[PDB]
Design a protein around this ligand. Structure first.
Ligand SMILES: CCCCCCCCCCCCCCCCCC(=O)OC[C@H](COP(=O)([O-])OCC(O)COP(=O)([O-])OC[C@@H](COC(=O)CCCCCCCCCCCCCCCCC)OC(=O)CCCCCCCCCCCCCCCCC)OC(=O)CCCCCCCCCCCCCCCCC
Ligand SMILES: CCCCCCCCCCCCCCCCCC(=O)OC[C@H](COP(=O)([O-])OCC(O)COP(=O)([O-])OC[C@@H](COC(=O)CCCCCCCCCCCCCCCCC)OC(=O)CCCCCCCCCCCCCCCCC)OC(=O)CCCCCCCCCCCCCCCCC
Ligand SMILES: CCCCCCCCCCCCCCCCCC(=O)OC[C@H](COP(=O)([O-])OCC(O)COP(=O)([O-])OC[C@@H](COC(=O)CCCCCCCCCCCCCCCCC)OC(=O)CCCCCCCCCCCCCCCCC)OC(=O)CCCCCCCCCCCCCCCCC
Ligand SMILES: CCCCCCCCCCCCCCCCCC(=O)OC[C@H](COP(=O)([O-])OCC[N+](C)(C)C)OC(=O)CCCCCCCCCCCCCCCCC
Ligand SMILES: CCCCCCCCCCCCCCCCCC(=O)OC[C@H](COP(=O)(O)OCCN)OC(=O)CCCCCCCCCCCCCCCCC
Ligand SMILES: CCCCCCCCCCCCCCCCCC(=O)OC[C@H](COP(=O)(O)OCCN)OC(=O)CCCCCCCCCCCCCCCCC
Ligand SMILES: CCCCCCCCCCCCCCCCCC(=O)OC[C@H](COP(=O)(O)OCCN)OC(=O)CCCCCCCCCCCCCCCCC
Ligand SMILES: CCCCCCCCCCCCCCCCCC(=O)OC[C@H](COP(=O)(O)OCCN)OC(=O)CCCCCCCCCCCCCCCCC
Ligand SMILES: CCCCCCCCCCCC(=O)OC[C@H](COP(=O)(O)OCC[N+](C)(C)C)OC(=O)CCCCCCCCCCC
Ligand SMILES: Nc1nc2c(ncn2[C@H]2C[C@H](O)[C@@H](COP(=O)(O)OP(=O)(O)OP(=O)(O)O)O2)c(=O)[nH]1
Ligand SMILES: [Mg+2]
Ligand SMILES: [Zn+2]
Lengths: 320, 347, 459, 98, 40, 99
């Protein structure tokens, strides 16, 4: 029985599988701040599904066979190419950011769908709420134009409002001089080109806008570089939180029915990520968009709806 | 809304219309409109934003005003006849008030100003109920009182509706405003043939409802409310572009499509009554409707508008919306012309 | 007519159920077979036409138009293979489906026995034609061309719908056989003056009549090659065919209502033929030549004489094969230089010797060299108009002089002289292109050996 | 008919003309809408009571019940407008086709 | 020459509040994408 | 740039990869068969047999019969002193004039 009004009427309600342990945790932080390690530990010490940070190819992992698709089907946006030539004239800087916001928006919907359907909590590296720190980091370095920020805010103000903020925000703070050092140790040829001004702007966005804005509706835990290494301390603090603010208190089976209907319809989630604002960075011509679409339908298991592809081993199509 | 409450409200919208259609007493006709209006407001405000509040408020003020004129017609008809039976009215003043009351409920010109703004301010699902189901009750009453309707008045509302609806839609880019004006234009066709053959009012109403339902359903499938948001459809659901082309040509009255049948039969009936100037004027003026239908075909199916990079993420997910009866409606709305003499089942 | 309607419908499953690389081969081969069987309609009698059933009938007028219509579908498929090679397979098969729908509507249009059935099919040819122009045209102006082609035809067709329905209410029937016997004279009154305009304006706009022709230089030029061929070869002849039928029920009011249109056409001949002398676009020069050739048809139909009717039918068939050939010849250049300007590529006779032979023959037919059926039709129309008014020979004579000037100017400007130095992509003519021209000109000349089968009912 | 019908029927016209000519306040217009019902209630009651149409005597009560239910919906919409804009002025309801 | 398809200049003609600009409607702006006007 | 659009593709010379190309298709096997169907059904069937079919039509619109019939009437009428052709098409014995 696929979820819908009939399932909700027959008993499938959100406040029958959610418990005190059904929480949504996002582990924010700067580059090389150790969040990926901390978040992976919080999830396993609380029985929570873990979501690795949404990258360029996140959507591919959740659809089809799970393997990444050729980059042409992601818009050719590259994180490696962003570091080398952040001032590129082909708009790869903003077209990267716009694609990443959609990926996080898609991931956040998948997380909420898991929390509501199964009742199990989830841990995210970053979220649509914190994703703007990179945008104003790009803008303040001159990597993107103002029209790119205006377009970004238009997409955010029509998509963010439809969802609920995380229960707990975990911020791992690492000063910029230390972050530069940790970037060098991993020694990624493209990442090492990151400038300290870019890293500093991320913190200013994190410090000035994200934390003071999420603290009035979420539980905020601001650890440091040394404190973050103590996972048992983090799990202990989270389990002692009070949860006395934010919109998750003013929710019922009726409101969560609407939320689940939206988050299971992925085309509905991504509806305004492609609004007809003709920004050069994200606009694609009709000839190139047409050519790529035809190539996409020729990939294995993509021509038809899932379960109707006879070239990947689907049978009973004539009775299905 | 709670899903059960949503169904209870829809059944009350339908019950009020059914009460109007099965009633022999003028009081029960008025009650049906009152019940129908009471249960339509909540679905017009299911989104809870300022634009829906304004749309419901304008809808409430117009329908309440019409409902009071309808009562005044009934009481005047009671004073001069002493009976409540739903039939021809027994007083010229009662006829005019009832006709103008039903013209306001239908949104016919010059009482049309609410239709475009109310439709724009409510979701596509509620616009569909507004422009298709809400016209069944006022047309049911007009079908019964037409022997005593002033001929000049009813034909004047028809001509104005065709003109205003035709001219209004030319200046529109919002789809819900385009459909609202297309509705006013077709209301004039239904009521222009009413004195001559009310069976061609049902034919035009039924074909229009099918075509309008098909259009809204395909706008809901892709969650499109603007011309430019509808011009991205070729890069997501190419099939939905060809179906929109076929349904838009049919709405324009182009043969060999179904939407030609109403225009064809209305002209046949009016010329039988030696009405030549009016059908010619209506047919030519209906080309205004065809023009702004053809614009949507250009930007949706017959050209490939610029796309967006984030569109590539939509190629990976299917359409999960119900699209109920869409395969059946699109065929009925385009391929029914060979079965035209079936219209006599409405007799 | 079910022996032709059904096979045409079956060309759609054939295209959609065929191998991806055989769509052109399969559709071309079976459209040539349907053309072959169309010759059975030649079973004509000297007194009675072929009256198949209550719906469809064929006489000596519709039969040549049916044969021409079914012959052009294979030629349209050949002419479109090149520019549609880099096209999505589903969209290649939708282009062919529009061509098949157009033939399906045309064959039912020319044989419809009831006028209202003729009207619906006559009007249904707009949709596939509109879609071909706006979807598979190349330039920006195809969108505006489609709107002009659409609203010019409906501005005249809708009044025709009212007039036809009025006629049935008063006469009782619209069956064309019934009208032959129940027809009554048209009394001279203001009411009948407008029944005449409503019954003829739709067909004159589609001919087109000079003054209402502005849609033709747009649509015929902006359409793809297949669109241009059908537009100029079969769809201009819906207006001429309609007037031949509808004029039965407009007597005697036609003998004075015809003056404003005989004057527009006679003087429109000279204006449109003169425009061609100064056209920069090669495809546009050919488009205006159709306006000047259909001017004679309008005059012939309106003066209502056996010789004018025989000339009108020969002209429509002769013009169908010649204008269609010229568009294909022009498109042959365009597919190499990708420009419609006439003065861009010159001296092409030194680079494409055999294609210059087709240009010559297409130019000689266009200027009505005897004894081609182009001259037979044109001559028969000059003879009839001379009896109508001896002064008309002046206007007919002047148009002949202008016709030769712009026919050979097109030949000289594009084929002779020095070749353009910087154009070095003029590849040798393909076998597809040469065979396409041979399929136009050979039937056009073989008809000279048996002209009677295109001379119409009055023969 | 009787000069009582002259004034009651003129009361309906005054309320109708009052309703169709908004000043500023939505609440003032909702009163004109409810004044039309009162004029209809009195007009309907006089006709029924005078003609001794016994069974119709329940009709004026049904008219009062539905129009009051309709009025309740009107106040609810007015209250929602006030929350949005702080005042019930009809001049703030022009977001649609401004 | 490849087939012409609308560019951004062409498509922007169908993006304003109205198709035919005038002095009176120059003040109009396109509605919100989600039909929601910010509270205030 | 104003957008990310593909470059205008350069036209492809069909003779480069196939100097025996008939112009119908890129695949030589399909190219040859498309040429064969057009030439056989176009020239061998329709133009040759169609021309032969038309040349032997059974007296298209009865013009040989008309000449044959007129020969009898001219022979008969002249052999009996009758006019070769009468100026009245319908015998006036059954026509009633207005007044
Ligand atoms: C004639 C042929 C034309 C037929 C036209 C059919 C049109 C179908 C439109 C497509 C439906 C769709 O996609 O949903 C959009 C829309 C729902 O909006 P949504 O945003 O997608 O979701 C709604 C909730 O917000 C979402 O929240 P939720 O999901 O949590 O809970 C809602 C839940 C609730 O579930 C239901 O909706 C159950 C509703 C049952 C209603 C009773 C059905 C009839 C039986 C009566 C006994 O789910 C649905 O709403 C199901 C979608 C509706 C499907 C119903 C289709 C069958 C009815 C159409 C047949 C005509 C009957 C009259 C229609 C109603 C008239 C007012 O559907 C509608 O509400 C409109 C219904 C159609 C009304 C106009 C119909 C034309 C009027 C003339 C009637 C025909 C006869 C006269 C001509 C002859
Ligand atoms: C009276 C005699 C008419 C008998 C009609 C019986 C079929 C109606 C029930 C079909 C249904 O379940 O969905 C209808 C309806 C909506 O279904 P749908 O999306 O339009 O059907 C397409 C799906 O793919 C549906 O595909 P699916 O895979 O989801 O389910 C397959 C479905 C069977 O699905 C179907 O067969 C759908 C197509 C059935 C025809 C529906 C159109 C109504 C037929 C009459 C219309 C005639 C047009 C006028 C005739 C021409 C006039 C000249 O199987 C059944 O439900 C068994 C039949 C019920 C027992 O159900 C509703 O929720 C609204 C009520
Ligand atoms: C008993 C003998 C049987 C034979 C009879 C002859 C057949 C008559 C059928 C008429 C009914 C047609 C509707 C039912 C079939 C629909 C099935 C379908 O949608 O998939 C096709 C299906 C797709 O196959 P596939 O291998 O999966 O490839 C596609 C991929 O799956 C997916 O790849 P994709 O995503 O790229 O594909 C996207 C899209 C391509 O999207 C694009 O991007 C193309 C955009 C530009 C195209 C613009 C041209 C649009 C042409 C349609 C115009 C509509 C107005 C019609 C006006 C009438 C004059 C044309 O491709 C399409 O599928 C579009 C074609 C389907 C359009 C449905 C049209 C419904 C309205 C038709 C109204 C007809 C009214 C007739 C008059 C009334 C009197 C009866 O084809 C088949 O496999 C076999 C089906 C055979 C039917 C072919 C469809 C032709 C329909 C359009 C021609 C209309 C002919 C009208 C003649 C009227 C005079 C009699
Ligand atoms: C140089 C030629 C020298 C003369 C050769 C001697 C033979 C000769 O000329 O006469 C033989 C015949 C005429 O000779 P005939 O008429 O004097 O007599 C023939 C034999 N008997 C005596 C029995 C009647 O030539 C023809 O009839 C040719 C007919 C033309 C066929 C054209 C259509 C063929 C293509 C099919 C249609 C497809 C195209 C569609 C176009 C639209 C059609 C409306
Ligand atoms: C027998 C027949 C003989 C008489 C035939 C006369 C010729 C027919 C009339 C001309 C047909 C119309 C030609 C096309 C007009 C046109 O395309 O105008 C385009 C113009 C440009 O603006 P637009 O295209 O909308 O903006 C986007 C640009 N990419 O857009 C505009 O300016 C808007 C134009 C809207 C009006 C065109 C649609 C109506 C055409 C028929 C006339 C309407 C019926 C008459 C009115 C009835 C009385 C009220
Ligand atoms: C530039 C814009 C120019 C627009 C010109 C508009 C002209 C309008 C003319 C009014 C129509 C005249 C008319 O009413 O028809 C005459 C007559 C009506 O009276 P009736 O009852 O039919 O008399 C005999 C009944 N046994 O009815 C009849 O006798 C039959 C007439 C029916 C003819 C079709 C409908 C009327 C004519 C349509 C317009 C004609 C012009 C077409 C131009 C196309 C452009
Ligand atoms: C660019 C637009 C192109 C499309 C244009 C639209 C078509 C033209 C409009 C149609 C005009 C039709 C005339 C309708 C008016 C009524 C005509 C009429 O009743 O005339 C009757 C009159 C009497 O008949 P009589 O000549 O004396 O001899 C027979 C007597 N039983 O006999 C006559 O009067 C003779 C016939 C009518 C008068 C003809 C005068 C023609 C003048 C030159 C026309 C040139 C074209 C003008 C178009 C400008 C654009
Ligand atoms: C026999 C018939 C007998 C029945 C007759 C019925 C009419 C009797 C009078 C009824 C009372 C009048 C209704 C109230 C009119 C009204 O409220 O008008 C308000 C309107 C707006 O006013 P405001 O928003 O303040 O803007 C002013 C800018 N300086 O202000 C205005 O725009 C102008 C105010 C004019 C006031 C006179 C209105 C009555 C005349 C018009 C009705 C014609 C019938
Ligand atoms: C047969 C016949 O008569 O076949 C003769 C011809 C082919 O002639 P060929 O021998 O291939 O030489 C000619 C070709 N060249 C010069 C390249 C070698 O048929 C065809 O191609 C007809 C089309 C194939 C399908 C025929 C179906 C008939 C029903
Ligand atoms: N332009 C842009 N780059 C982003 C965004 N999110 C991540 N990135 C980039 C910045 C980094 O160089 C790169 C890797 O991010 P991480 O912080 O997760 O790296 P890493 O796992 O090594 O650090 P960690 O220990 O998890 O804290 O991804 C974004 O929203 N916009
Ligand atoms: Mg990490
Ligand atoms: Zn080319």
């Amino acid at each position: 029985l696929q979820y819908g009004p009939l399932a909700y009427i027959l008993g499938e309600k959100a406040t029958k599988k959610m418990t005190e342990k059904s929480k949504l945790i996002t582990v924010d932080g700067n580059i090389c701040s150790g969040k990926s390690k901390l978040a992976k530990e919080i999830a396993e010490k609380l029985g929570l599904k873990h979501f690795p940070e949404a990258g360029i190819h996140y959507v591919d992992s959740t659809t089809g066979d799970g393997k990444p698709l050729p980059v042409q089907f992601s818009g050719n946006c590259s994180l490696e190419k962003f570091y080398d030539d952040p001032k590129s004239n082909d708009g790869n800087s903003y077209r990267l950011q716009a694609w990443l916001y959609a990926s996080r928006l898609l991931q956040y919907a998948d997380a909420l769908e898991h929390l509501l359907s199964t009742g199990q909590g989830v841990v995210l590296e970053r979220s649509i709420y914190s994703d703007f720190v990179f945008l104003e980091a790009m803008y303040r370095q001159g990597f993107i134009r103002k029209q790119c920020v205006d377009h970004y805010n238009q997409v955010k103000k029509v998509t963010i409002c439809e969802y609920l903020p995380p229960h707990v925000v975990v911020y791992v703070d690492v000063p910029v001089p230390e972050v530069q050092s940790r970037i060098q140790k991993k020694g990624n040829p493209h990442e090492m080109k990151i400038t300290s001004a870019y890293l500093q702007d991320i913190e200013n966005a994190y410090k000035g806008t994200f934390l003071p804005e999420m603290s009035e509706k979420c539980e905020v835990l601001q650890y440091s570089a040394w404190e973050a290494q103590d996972a048992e301390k983090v799990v202990e603090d989270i389990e002692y939180l009070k949860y006395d603010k934010g919109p998750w208190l003013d929710q019922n089976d009726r409101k969560l029915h609407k939320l689940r209907m939206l988050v299971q319809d992925k085309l509905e989630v991504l509806n305004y990520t492609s609004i007809p604002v003709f920004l050069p960075e994200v606009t694609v011509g009709a000839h190139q968009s047409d050519q790529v679409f035809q190539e996409f339908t020729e990939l294995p298991g993509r021509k038809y709806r899932a379960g109707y592809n006879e070239d990947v081993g689907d049978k009973w199509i004539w009775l299905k | 809304m709670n899903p059960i409450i949503f169904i209870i409200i829809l059944l009350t919208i339908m019950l009020g219309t059914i009460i109007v259609m099965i009633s022999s007493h003028w009081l029960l006709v008025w009650i049906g409109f009152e019940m129908n209006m009471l249960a339509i407001i909540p679905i017009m405000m299911k989104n809870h934003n300022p634009r829906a509040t304004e749309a419901s408020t304008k809808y409430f003020l117009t329908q309440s005003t019409a409902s009071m004129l309808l009562m005044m017609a009934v009481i005047i008809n009671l004073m001069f006849s002493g009976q409540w039976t739903v039939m021809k009215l027994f007083n010229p003043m009662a006829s005019m008030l009832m006709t103008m009351a039903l013209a306001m409920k239908l949104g016919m010109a010059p009482f049309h100003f609410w239709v475009p703004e109310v439709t724009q301010g409510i979701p596509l699902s509620s616009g569909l109920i507004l422009l298709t189901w809400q016209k069944l009750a006022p047309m049911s009453v007009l079908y019964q009182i037409f022997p005593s309707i002033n001929l000049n008045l009813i034909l004047t509302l028809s001509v104005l509706s065709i003109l205003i609806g035709g001219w209004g839609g030319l200046n529109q880019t919002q789809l819900r405003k385009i459909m609202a004006y297309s509705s006013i234009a077709h209301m004039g066709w239904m009521t222009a043939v009413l004195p001559y053959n009310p069976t061609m009012t049902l034919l035009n109403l039924i074909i229009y409802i099918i075509m309008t339902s098909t259009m809204f359903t395909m706008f809901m499938a892709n969650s499109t409310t603007t011309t430019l948001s509808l011009s991205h459809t070729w890069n997501k659901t190419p099939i939905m572009t060809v179906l929109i082309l076929a349904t838009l040509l049919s709405m324009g009255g182009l043969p060999p499509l179904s939407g030609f049948m109403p225009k064809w039969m209305i002209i046949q009936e009016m010329t039988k009554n030696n009405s030549i100037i009016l059908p010619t004027f209506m047919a030519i003026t209906a080309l205004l409707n065809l023009y702004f239908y053809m614009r949507l075909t250009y930007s949706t199916t017959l050209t490939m508008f610029p796309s967006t990079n984030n569109m590539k993420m939509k190629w990976q997910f299917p359409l999960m919306k119900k699209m109920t009866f869409l395969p059946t409606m699109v065929v009925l709305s385009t391929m029914m012309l060979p079965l035209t003499p079936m219209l006599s089942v409405l007799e | 007519m079910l022996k032709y309607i059904i096979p045409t419908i079956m060309l759609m499953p054939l295209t959609w159920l065929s191998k991806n690389n055989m769509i052109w081969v399969n559709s071309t081969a079976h459209s040539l077979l349907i053309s072959f069987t169309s010759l059975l309609l030649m079973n004509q009698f000297g007194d009675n036409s072929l009256n198949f059933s209550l719906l469809f009938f064929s006489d000596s007028l519709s039969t040549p138009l049916l044969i021409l219509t079914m012959w052009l579908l294979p030629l349209m498929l050949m002419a479109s293979q090149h520019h549609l090679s880099k096209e999505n397979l589903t969209r290649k098969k939708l282009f062919i489906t529009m061509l098949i729908s157009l033939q399906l509507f045309l064959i039912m249009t020319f044989t419809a026995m009831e006028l209202i059935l003729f009207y619906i099919l006559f009007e249904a040819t707009l949709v596939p034609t509109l879609i071909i122009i706006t979807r598979w045209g190349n330039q920006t102006e195809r969108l505006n061309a489609g709107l002009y082609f659409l609203f010019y035809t409906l501005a005249g067709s809708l009044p025709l719908l009212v007039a036809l329905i009025y006629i049935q209410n008063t006469v009782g029937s619209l069956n064309f056989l019934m009208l032959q016997y129940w027809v009554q004279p048209v009394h001279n009154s203001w009411s009948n003056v407008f029944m005449w305009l409503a019954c003829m304006m739709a067909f004159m706009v589609k001919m087109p009549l000079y003054g209402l022709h502005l849609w033709l230089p747009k649509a015929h030029v902006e359409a793809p090659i297949a669109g241009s061929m059908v537009l100029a070869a079969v769809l201009l002849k819906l207006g001429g065919y309609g007037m031949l039928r509808i004029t039965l029920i407009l007597n005697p009011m036609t003998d004075f209502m015809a003056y404003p249109f005989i004057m527009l056409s006679l003087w429109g001949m000279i204006m449109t033929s003169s425009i061609c002398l100064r056209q920069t676009d090669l495809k546009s020069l050919i488009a205006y030549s159709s306006v000047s050739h259909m001017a004679l048809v309008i005059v012939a139909i309106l003066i209502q004489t056996p010789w004018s009717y025989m000339g009108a039918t020969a002209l429509m068939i002769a013009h169908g094969l010649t204008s269609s050939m010229l568009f294909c010849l022009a498109n042959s250049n365009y597919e190499r230089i990708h420009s419609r300007t006439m003065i861009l590529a010159r001296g092409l006779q030194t680079l494409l010797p055999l294609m210059a032979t087709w240009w010559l023959l297409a130019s000689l037919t266009n200027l009505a060299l005897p004894p081609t059926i182009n001259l037979i039709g044109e001559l028969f129309v000059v003879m009839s108009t001379f009896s109508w008014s001896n002064i008309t020979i002046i206007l007919m004579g002047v148009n002949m002089v202008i016709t030769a000037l712009y026919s050979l100017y097109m030949l000289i400007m594009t084929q002779r002289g020095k070749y353009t130095y910087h154009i070095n992509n003029i590849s040798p003519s393909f076998t597809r292109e040469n065979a396409l021209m041979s399929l136009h000109i050979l039937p056009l000349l073989l008809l000279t050996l048996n002209p009677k089968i295109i001379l119409g009912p009055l023969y | 008919m009787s000069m009582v019908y002259m004034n009651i029927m003129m009361a309906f016209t005054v309320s109708l003309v009052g309703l169709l000519m908004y000043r500023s306040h939505l609440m003032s217009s909702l009163l004109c809408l409810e004044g039309m019902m009162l004029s209809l209630f009195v007009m309907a009651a006089l006709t029924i009571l005078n003609s001794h149409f016994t069974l119709a005597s329940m009709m004026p009560i049904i008219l009062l019940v539905f129009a009051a239910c309709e009025a309740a919906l009107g106040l609810s919409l007015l209250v929602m407008v006030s929350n949005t804009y702080g005042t019930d002025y009809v001049q703030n309801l022009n977001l649609l086709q401004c | 020459a490849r087939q012409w398809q609308p560019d951004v200049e062409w498509a922007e003609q169908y993006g304003g509040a109205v198709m035919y600009p005038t002095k009176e409607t120059a003040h109009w702006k396109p509605p919100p994408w989600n039909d929601v006007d910010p509270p205030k | 740039l104003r957008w990310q659009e593909d470059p205008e593709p350069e036209d492809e010379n069909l003779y480069e990869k196939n100097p025996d190309s008939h112009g119908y298709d890129k695949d030589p096997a399909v190219d040859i068969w498309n040429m064969r169907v057009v030439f056989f059904f176009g020239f061998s069937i329709v133009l040759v047999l169609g021309s032969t079919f038309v040349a032997y039509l059974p007296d298209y619109r009865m013009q040989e019969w008309a000449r044959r019939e007129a020969e009898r009437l001219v022979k008969y009428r002249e052999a009996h002193g009758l006019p070769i052709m009468e100026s009245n098409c319908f015998d006036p014995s059954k026509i009633q004039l207005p007044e």
